[PDB]
Predict the 3D structure of the following.
Amino acid sequence: ALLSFERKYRVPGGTLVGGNLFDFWVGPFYVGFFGVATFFFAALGIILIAWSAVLQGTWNPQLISVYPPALEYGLGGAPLAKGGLWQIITICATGAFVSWALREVEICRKLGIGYHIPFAFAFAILAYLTLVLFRPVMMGAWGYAFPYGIWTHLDWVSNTGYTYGNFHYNPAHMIAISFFFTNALALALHGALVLSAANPEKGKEMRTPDHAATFFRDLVGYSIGTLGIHRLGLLLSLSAVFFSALCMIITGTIWFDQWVDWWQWWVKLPWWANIPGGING
Amino acid sequence: DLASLAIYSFWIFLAGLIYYLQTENMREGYPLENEDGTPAANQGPFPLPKPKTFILPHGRGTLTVPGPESEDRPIALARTAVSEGFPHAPTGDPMKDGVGPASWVARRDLPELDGHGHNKIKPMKAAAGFHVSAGKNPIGLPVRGCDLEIAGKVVDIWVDIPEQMARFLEVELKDGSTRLLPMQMVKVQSNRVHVNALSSDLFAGIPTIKSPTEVTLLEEDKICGYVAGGLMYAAPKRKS
Amino acid sequence: AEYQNIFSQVQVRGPADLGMTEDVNLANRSGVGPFSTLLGWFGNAQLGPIYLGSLGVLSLFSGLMWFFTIGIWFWYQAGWNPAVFLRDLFFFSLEPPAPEYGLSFAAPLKEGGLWLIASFFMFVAVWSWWGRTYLRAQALGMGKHTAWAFLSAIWLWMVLGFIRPILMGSWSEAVPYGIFSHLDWTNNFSLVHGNLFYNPFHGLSIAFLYGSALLFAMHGATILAVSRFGGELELEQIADRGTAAERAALFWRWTMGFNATMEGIHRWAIWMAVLVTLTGGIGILLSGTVVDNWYVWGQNHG
Ligand code: BCL
Ligand code: BCL
Ligand code: BCL
Ligand SMILES: CC[C@H]1c2cc3[nH]c4c(c3C)C(=O)[C@H](C(=O)OC)c4c3nc(cc4[nH]c(cc(n2)[C@@H]1C)c(C(C)=O)c4C)[C@@H](C)[C@@H]3CCC(=O)OC/C=C(\C)CCC[C@@H](C)CCC[C@H](C)CCCC(C)C
Ligand SMILES: CC[C@H]1c2cc3[nH]c4c(c3C)C(=O)[C@H](C(=O)OC)c4c3nc(cc4[nH]c(cc(n2)[C@@H]1C)c(C(C)=O)c4C)[C@@H](C)[C@@H]3CCC(=O)OC/C=C(\C)CCC[C@H](C)CCC[C@H](C)CCCC(C)C
Ligand SMILES: COC(C)(C)C(=O)C/C=C(\C)CC/C=C(\C)CC/C=C(\C)CCCC/C(C)=C/CC[C@H](C)CC/C=C(\C)CCC=C(C)C
Ligand SMILES: CCCCCCCCCCCC[N+](C)(C)[O-]
Ligand SMILES: CCCCCCCCCCCC[N+](C)(C)[O-]
Ligand SMILES: [Fe+3]
């Protein structure tokens, strides 16, 4: 039930709403008002999926798929079997995520720790909402959103992307990718540094963060430090997801043509737009 | 075919990996226990990992984990319900008894040494060459509490020499004694330092150190711990 | 509001840290560089010193001749006209030799030879630097983790321009050198093999790519939240568990049923990220050599 050192930590208090009504634990899971709001939105939402499963004629996860209401419906409502369920489910879903964020806030409070984890999470939630909400609304229908299916949601990425040619040319999507790459690199390096210092060669004594800060200076001529590498992770991670929403919010709204033809602003600049030779000349 | 074989292999591999990874995160905190401190029944699918010994630097001994765990201190808590799974109420003054968000750990009562044998955290007056390169200089400023009434003034900046970074701010009260407030708990301003965590009358409560030139691992925790638990316990003495 | 510890609020400077010695040849470490007050808010402000040495300069050189070789070819395409260079900078490209030549080196410089040169000079530069990351750890008596993890990144890169082009039969299946051009290769490659999306590895590969953004945002934010207890001082928390290590675990135990240790999380961290290039490397290796179309493969699994 408890970690050898957990009892001194489980004290009353920290609850944003409710007081002490749901201020207890279920096994190793902390409950809380939002702990109960979550189980609700989730249970109900899982039901709407098993029901959108009988209406499709399949119980195979690899087949099961909940599609959005066709473009003819706009931002209006739709019959359950035809766009209805997805819509309640996006509500149950959005309701499950925000409620899980607020449940971490109550946890944060108990322990007296910082509210950086729920904050971070909120960036994830915003990406989801960018796709199932902010973008569709801006375009004019819930048909521009993605479906809830293991392989059908990928069909959407695929079709959605090429709908503008090689999506690779989206400037924002371009940036967003580097942060995703960098983060991995940093995550590799970091977990690889700490582990090496605390796990040296045989018979040798545990190295110190001084050996660590050296190692990198000897390697790249610089050591960001402990507090820095963590500020770096968090920053690259969130920055990576920030440019992913930004690349999609502008796709179909301010820019709806071929992304490759956008980079023609740079090439057709009066200064060199007509000098013969090169690739375009 | 190969592909189908490569992929069937991976998942078998990944399963051993997750197996491998989880047992490793059980070196500390396990085995689990019942609310009364006795060995819990259901310990989970994964078993405890074979012990591993670390060789602490500067010949300070060894560390074997998993190893016999103990809080090595008295806990001032009591049950609030007759069923396992509820909060335990502080029998005294949480801040002083060391529980909840104000609890600490019985770390080693020895200061931290850098790669070269020297204490890792020193005051700045004892740190030759160090100075405030940028940002407002806290030393000299009054420290205000979460009740808007002054509690003291900054006298020095205990810095981390190896990472050249301020960890604490020495503070002088009325009785003329000093205290350590963690850097990550104060807002340094243009004319004052703010501590939303503690209220005027709680700085004296802060645990004090034995040597005026060193903070031990144990003392670091009591300090940081005490300062943090006041976000909950000092709440009735704050205004926004 | 509350302090978030994102940016330092007070900077502190002391005598340039020349670092630990151990079995290092202090004769190679250069001098201390300047101090960047700018970089000093995020983290440390000390630039330098950097350990050069034999194998290290080798890499630096091989790495510059790679950039310079691609550069002069970029200029041949630019017609040595300064204005064109900045214009079509992303359009240019040093493509690999025609499929006709196959795996030979007797190709002309204006039709593929200049590529091969560039690739040899980069084959040297990367491997020699790999070795540098291993040796630089041997000298400090540390574990070779950074070494092995850098190997996986190489695994993908190798497969992309060495191992695969050789298993296929020509240097034409290799990746070109250009901004936009290597962006089309990526797209083409999927198209030619039936949309990579149907590739189990490429999809397992994205699982970890996203997973790294989740683990690192998670780890970083958790460590920042507990730094008020000396969380960022992990190695320290490893040899002596403090309240920062227990509260950090308890938050995640009460949130999702299970937690990790100050060290354990760095084993998730390291493996989570490495498994990115490890899988996408098996996926690209088996693509075009054992499997011609992934949609097809997808219907069978044989
Ligand atoms: C994985 C499948 C494809 C692929 C798909 C994509 C896609 C899709 C995208 C990129 C993107 C990039 N890719 Mg690519 N990329 C591949 C293999 C590579 C290899 C390689 C040696 O194997 C290299 C060096 C690159 C290089 C690059 C950068 C130009 C750019 C940002 C990468 C990054 O964030 O790294 C992070 C790492 C670092 C900390 C260090 C490296 C720093 C960067 C700036 C590299 C500079 C060196 C030099 C080659 C750049 C020249 C530009 C100026 C003329 C100086 N790619 C393979 C073939 N790559 C993004 C881009 O913007 O393209 C235009 C993008 O959207
Ligand atoms: C954000 C970018 C694109 C997109 C592009 C892709 C691409 C491209 C790929 C995936 C892949 C996956 N996607 Mg997707 N995906 C999007 C939005 C989502 C949403 C969402 C609610 O917003 C979710 C839940 C998923 C979930 C998933 C998984 C099924 C799979 C592995 C992801 C992973 O490892 O992440 C990292 C996270 C973790 C390791 C934490 C644990 C995550 C587990 C695996 C979650 C599974 C949930 C799933 C089974 C449904 C449960 C819902 C109900 C409660 C039953 N995607 C949008 C539209 N997705 C890959 C795949 O192989 O699937 C076909 C793949 O190739
Ligand atoms: C139209 C495009 C195709 C497609 C075609 C490909 C191809 C082709 C490939 C990928 C690859 C990848 N794809 Mg895909 N992919 C598509 C859509 C997606 C989507 C999505 C739709 O949302 C996502 C999330 C991804 C994500 C990814 C990554 C998981 C994966 C590469 C991981 C990596 O970090 O390599 C980045 C890391 C490296 C290249 C390692 C290189 C390391 C070297 C040593 C660096 C040296 C630097 C150099 C010397 C210069 C020095 C630097 C300077 C000093 C600055 N793909 C569609 C279906 N994808 C790769 C893969 O693994 O697939 C299985 C790959 O080859
Ligand atoms: C496990 C997967 C991830 C990973 C891990 C990884 N990469 C690594 C490592 C590890 C663990 C290292 O230890 C090693 C390293 O030393 O990093 C600090 C490396 C590394 N990964 C690098 C890049 C890199 N890794 C990438 C990817 C990834 N690496 C994965 C996501 C990518 C991509 C494409 O995503 C890139 C671009 C290098 C930074 C470094 C390997 C360095 C190397 O081999 O150098 C060889 C050659 C030279 C010395 C060339 C120098 C030539 C330059 C002077 C030319 C450019 C000049 C330019 C205009 C300069 C200005 C830049 C401005 C920003 C100021
Ligand atoms: C912002 C940077 C990255 C990030 C960070 C991040 N994620 C986080 C956190 C953080 C900091 C957490 O604290 C929180 C966590 O607790 O992690 C363990 C979380 C988390 N990120 C998760 C997943 C996740 N994060 C992802 C992405 C990312 N997370 C980013 C790349 C992804 C993908 C696809 O990249 C996934 C799959 C969860 C493991 C966890 C949040 C768990 C949670 O919200 O529980 C509440 C909800 C339920 C129990 C289930 C609800 C069921 C629904 C009502 C119905 C199902 C609808 C769904 C839309 C169907 C989709 C089907 C698909 C096939 C498309
Ligand atoms: C300012 O102008 C001057 C001239 C001064 C410059 O210097 C400017 C220079 C620039 C314009 C340079 C620009 C350079 C880029 C745009 C480079 C971009 C590079 C990429 C996008 C590369 C992507 C992918 C590369 C891959 C996967 C390479 C793989 C290489 C290998 C595995 C090596 C394989 C080895 C070969 C085939 C030969 C082996 C031979 C043996 C004998 C072993
Ligand atoms: C008291 C025992 C409690 C054990 C419960 C452990 C929860 C496991 C974490 C969720 C599993 C996740 N999943 C499905 C993504 O793999
Ligand atoms: C993709 C990530 C999946 C995480 C793997 C799940 C591990 C569950 C471990 C449960 C541990 C149970 N215990 C001992 C804490 O009660
Ligand atoms: Fe860490």
